């Protein structure tokens, strides 16, 4: 089966491309708690269809670029921008913690 994942598109800036964001819960292999990790998938938007804070399915594909292996299947939920403000701010925090 070609794999599908679901995410929120956290940034669009790229020509013809959106970056989606996919969480996975899963139990931890020793401590056993359920832990929740995420990954950014670079996914191929041919039409500039999908916008920021849109929640989409991503599907394994024939490679588009380096780093772009996935295309955007369909729109699940339109406009949850909290998720975005989250990722946005998680990254706004790197601004601290250095020198």
């Amino acid at each position: 089966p070609k794999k599908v994942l679901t995410g929120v598109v956290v940034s669009d800036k790229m020509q013809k491309t959106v970056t989606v964001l996919v969480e996975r819960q899963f139990p931890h292999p020793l401590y056993g708690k359920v832990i929740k990790r995420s990954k950014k998938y670079l996914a191929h938007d041919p039409e500039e269809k999908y916008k920021l804070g849109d929640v989409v399915e991503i599907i394994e594909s024939r490679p588009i670029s380096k780093r772009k292996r996935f295309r955007v299947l369909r729109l699940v939920e339109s406009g949850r921008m909290d998720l975005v403000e989250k990722y946005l701010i998680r990254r706004q925090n790197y601004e601290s913690l250095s020198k």
Binding site: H28, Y31, G32, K33
Partner: protein
């Protein structure tokens, strides 16, 4: 430690340090003596103990104890190193293997002969 705390940091699996750089990892190492001394044990005992400083095949240099009663070791002898320390002699982590290369088994010792390198006594 909570469990959140245990995932986000998690236990520290403790290393250890090898009480013997005969090293290379090896089980014995060949060396050549420098000084062959006679030394003064730490506080609780009293004695005179025979040890040799030794250059190793490892580019390494240590004092090594000479087990057994009598020994033939001069400053240019070649010798095999055993490892194991003596509690009461400051600085010595390694023993000497009698019967091997130059250090020769104790004359006349009839008893623990695997150690001390001596052969078996002849019989009539």
């Amino acid at each position: 430690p909570t469990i959140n705390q245990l995932v986000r940091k998690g236990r520290e699996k403790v290393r250890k340090k090898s009480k013997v750089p005969a090293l290379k990892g090896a089980p014995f190492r060949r060396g050549v003596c420098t000084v062959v001394r006679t030394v003064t044990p730490k506080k609780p005992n009293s004695a005179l103990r025979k040890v040799a400083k030794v250059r190793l095949t490892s580019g390494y240099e240590v004092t090594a104890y000479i087990p057994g009663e009598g020994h033939n070791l001069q400053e240019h002898s070649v010798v095999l190193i055993r490892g194991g320390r003596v509690k009461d002699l400051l600085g010595v982590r390694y023993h000497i293997v009698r019967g091997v290369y130059d250090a020769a088994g104790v004359k006349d010792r009839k008893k623990s002969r695997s150690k001390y390198g001596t052969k078996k006594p002849k019989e009539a």
